[PDB]
């Protein structure tokens, strides 16, 4: 209980469709109501997202 | 791999290192607009 | 560990970087850019950002705290002006068309005799022509004579289908009419080909809206740079559509095109090759009559044709076969055909 009430004591999150990407760990990240955005790649997941 | 605006450093190197921290704080940002009409004696 | 200043500079600037657009370029270390939601900034740009390739229509990298030019982008994969390039050979050169020999001279001597032959006109000092109007009843030879002609040319060619230039950037469209033309000058003096003309060019009607203003100014700088009368380098352009009494006149009238070729009607002559040569790639069995066929039937073109010669293989894989007999063409013949047959004064003129 006291789990899911510190996730829930928390900003959400966004999402973003991305075909392709270059390397180098910055991804570009297409959000849906705005345009592109070369972002950060995160240390807990791979690079290969492309 | 990627280009984002990259040269090799011979020319920018020497631009990087103060000039950038310059062009931040001090430097602001504005934005561009239309004007409709304007008044007389008074903005 | 050697790498230091070009980390630094990977790590000086913000990380979630935008993604913005080039509107115009002030040379003073600070210019003017767009965000993606048509919001635009009194920005300045940085000293690494290599400009050299700052042009107004490309795509920069943006902040959030000042929004300043972080580095310019790439075109990002947009093959835009590479793709609609021919780089294979089009179809058979000129045994496959039939019977329209009288249009061949005009285009042989208005391409290849300038390129070949470049002596006759300086002769006597005579120019050869731009452009190229092929019009006339539609799906006739219009498509099949360009590939025909540009079969047989020892210079570049373009294919241009006239969809693949209608964008919504409000840029986009008469940039890549420049980026054309820059490739078609810079490279040798390739062919020219926008097929359907009649969707960006008609009347020249103009309205207050937003959807029809990124059709004629793109339809506008077309005809400036088609005549922008400093370095052309003989491009010869052809331009087709079906219809012609619905389109832009100021580009039919001389000095812009001098060329207007018809291609009117068939005969009974020019559909047996056709026949044959749509009944050539299949297993034509030694049991079928195509002249039965052609005889009976007066009027169609060769995509009836081709979708006589695919009834008649689907009827032949129906019953199990490999090889197509006579019957599943008279079906074919008989089933197909029968979509337009309506309208004819018989047996009243001799």
Same mark, same amino acid.
């Given at each position: 209980l006291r789990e899911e009430l510190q996730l829930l004591q928390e900003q959400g999150s966004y999402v973003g469709e991305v075909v392709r990407a270059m390397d180098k760990k910055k991804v570009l990240v297409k959000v849906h109501p705005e345009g592109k955005f070369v972002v950060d790649v995160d240390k807990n997941i791979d690079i290969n997202d492309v | 791999e990627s280009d984002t605006g990259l040269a090799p450093p011979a020319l920018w190197d020497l631009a990087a290192d103060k000039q950038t921290l310059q062009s931040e704080q001090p430097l602001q940002v504005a934005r561009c607009t239309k004007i409709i009409n304007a008044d007389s004696e008074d903005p | 560990k050697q790498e230091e200043e070009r980390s630094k500079v990977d790590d000086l600037r913000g990380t979630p970087m935008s993604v913005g657009t080039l509107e115009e370029i002030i040379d003073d270390n600070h210019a003017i850019v767009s965000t993606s939601v048509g919001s635009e900034h009194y920005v300045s740009i940085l000293?690494?950002?290599?400009?050299?390739? /700052?042009?107004?229509g490309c795509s920069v990298l943006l902040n959030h705290?000042?929004?300043?030019?972080?580095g310019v982008l790439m @075109? @990002?994969?947009?093959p835009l002006v590479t793709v609609?390039?021919?780089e294979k050979a089009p179809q058979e050169? &000129?045994?496959?068309?039939?019977?329209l020999d009288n249009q061949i001279q005009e285009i042989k001597e208005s391409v290849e005799l300038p390129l070949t032959h470049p002596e006759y006109y300086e002769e006597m000092g005579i120019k050869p022509p731009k452009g190229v109007i092929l019009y006339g009843?539609?799906?006739?030879?219009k498509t099949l004579l360009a590939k025909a002609v540009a079969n047989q040319t020892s210079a570049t060619f373009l294919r241009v289908v006239?969809?693949?230039?209608?964008?919504? &950037?409000?840029?986009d469209g008469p940039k890549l009419v420049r980026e054309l033309f820059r490739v078609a000058e810079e490279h040798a003096p390739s062919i020219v080909f926008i097929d359907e003309i009649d969707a960006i060019g008609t009347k020249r009607y103009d309205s207050?809206?937003?959807?029809?203003r990124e059709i004629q100014r793109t339809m506008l700088e077309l005809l400036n740079q088609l005549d922008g009368?400093?370095?052309?380098?003989?491009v010869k352009v052809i331009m087709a559509t079906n219809?012609?009494?619905? /389109?832009?006149p100021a580009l039919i009238r001389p000095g812009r095109i001098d060329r207007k070729i018809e291609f009117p009607l068939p005969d009974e002559k020019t559909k047996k090759r056709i026949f044959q040569i749509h009944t050539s790639?299949?297993? /034509?069995? @030694?049991?079928?009559?195509?002249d039965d066929l052609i005889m009976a039937k007066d009027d169609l073109s060769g995509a009836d044709i081709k979708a006589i010669c695919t009834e008649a293989g689907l009827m032949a894989l129906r019953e199990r076969r490999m090889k197509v007999t006579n019957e599943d063409f008279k079906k074919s013949k008989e089933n197909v055909l029968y979509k337009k047959q309506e309208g004819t004064p018989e047996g009243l003129y001799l």
């Open positions: - | - | 000293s690494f950002v290599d400009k050299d390739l /700052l042009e107004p705290k000042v929004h300043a030019v972080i @075109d @990002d994969t947009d609609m390039k021919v050169t &000129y045994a496959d068309i039939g019977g009843p539609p799906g006739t030879g006239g969809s693949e230039l209608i964008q919504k &950037y409000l840029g207050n809206s937003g959807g029809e009368f400093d370095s052309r380098g003989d219809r012609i009494e619905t /389109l832009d790639r299949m297993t /034509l069995a @030694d049991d079928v009559t195509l």
